[PDB]
From a paper:
In non-spherical bacteria, the actin homologue [name] is essential for shape maintenance as depletion of [name] through genetic knockouts or [name]-targeted drug treatment results in misshapen cells that eventually lyse. The [name] fibres are attached to the cell membrane via a hydrophobic loop in Thermotoga maritima as well as Gram+ bacteria and via an additional N-terminal amphipathic helix in Gram− bacteria. Here, we demonstrate that [name] from Caulobacter crescentus forms pairs of antiparallel protofilaments as revealed by crystal structures, an architecture unprecedented among actin-like proteins. The crystal structure of Caulobacter [name] (ΔCcMreBdh) reveals the typical actin fold, containing two domains on either side of a nucleotide binding cleft (Kabsch and Holmes, 1995).
In contrast, the crystals of Caulobacter [name] contain doublets that, remarkably, crystallised in an antiparallel arrangement. Upon polymerisation, domain IB shows a rotation of 21.7° towards the nucleotide binding cleft as analysed by Dyndom (Hayward and Lee, 2002). This domain closure is accompanied by a twist between domains IA and IIA, as can be appreciated from the top view in Figure 6—figure supplement 2D and from the schematic in Figure 6C. The relatively small conformational change upon polymerisation has a dramatic effect on the chemistry of the active site. The catalytic site residues E140 and T167 coordinate the attacking water to be in line with the gamma phosphate in filamentous [name] (pink). In both proteins, the active site geometry in the filament conformation favours nucleotide hydrolysis, which is driven by a catalytic glutamate (E140 in CcMreB and E148 in ParM) that positions the catalytic water in line with the gamma phosphate. From the ΔCcMreBdh co-crystal structures with ADP and [name], it is clear that the active site could well accommodate a guanidine instead of an adenine as the major contacts are with the ribose and phosphate moieties of the nucleotide, a feature, again, shared with ParM.
Residue numbers in the entry: 12 to 97, 104 to 225, 229 to 334
Write the structure that this text describes.
Amino acid sequence: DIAIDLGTANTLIYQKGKGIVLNEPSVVALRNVGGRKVVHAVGIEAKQMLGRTPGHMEAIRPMRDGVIADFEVAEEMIKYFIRKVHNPKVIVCVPSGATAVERRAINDSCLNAGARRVGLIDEPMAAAIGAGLPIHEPTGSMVVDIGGGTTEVAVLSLSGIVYSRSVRVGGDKMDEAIISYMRRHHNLLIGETTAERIKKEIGTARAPEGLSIDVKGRDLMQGVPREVRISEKQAADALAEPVGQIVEAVKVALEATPPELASDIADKGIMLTGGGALLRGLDAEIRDHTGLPVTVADDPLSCVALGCGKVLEH
Ligand SMILES: Nc1ncnc2c1ncn2[C@@H]1O[C@H](COP(=O)(O)OP(=O)(O)NP(=O)(O)O)[C@@H](O)[C@H]1O
Ligand SMILES: [Mg+2]
């Protein structure tokens, strides 16, 4: 009786008639204890451990690039979360491009985690539903859902997918571009938590030098902590490659769209969902390159889960 948005960054569970009852980082901490590995923390508590664990301890993200990588740890993650909210029927989101291998792994791990039955829903369909798009109508709707692992672009109509594609670019690749930028341009080593803070605070899809923030890491030359100031322009330059990928995926989708649906999209524009939809200026950038209106869904982190939930209610 539940819907699971199983994401690289965040897992949400919608329960029938209750709405979203769990919203937690997709993180599992394991603790070494006599050669054996026990689950130590899952969720919010484990996320705060990333880049900060002592020797006996490991913080893991078992979902990468939109799909299950480490199946044993993902199963423990799903079990933990399903237990926390309580045999149910489950529907789970999956990237539209997920291969047959990747889909069977979600299915098996949910079955292994407790599910009686499992249905898979394509992420951009869920995202569109949850962002309030009229996906059941004979009209073209286009959604772009930018997560931590993948960016999903789709055109939907009549309760189905007209076009869809998953590209392996999103928030994680953005963080990695920022880490690489700090190393190459400032000879400073920063971690994933600092990179994500940069991205959220001054990260943007188009150069303005603009605002700035101070971050800390390890100075590579001196081997001591050092504080560096980074500007919106530098963050813009670091993010230019992944942002350009997302934009090209949108253009590719538009070229594949049947002309009457293209006509519909010209009116309605494009809807952005997912945590990556909050990247400053991403809406304007897509607008510039396509000619179309671009709207950011309200609370885009939760569109997929609300979409899966509405399916549960019908
Ligand atoms: N304000 C922000 N600006 C830029 N990026 C953001 C912002 N807020 C969150 N993010 C990113 O959004 C991502 C999380 O979004 P989310 O939609 O939950 O992805 P997901 O479902 O967990 N991953 P996926 O499996 O690829 O769909 C992370 O990479 C965040 O860093
Ligand atoms: Mg997602």
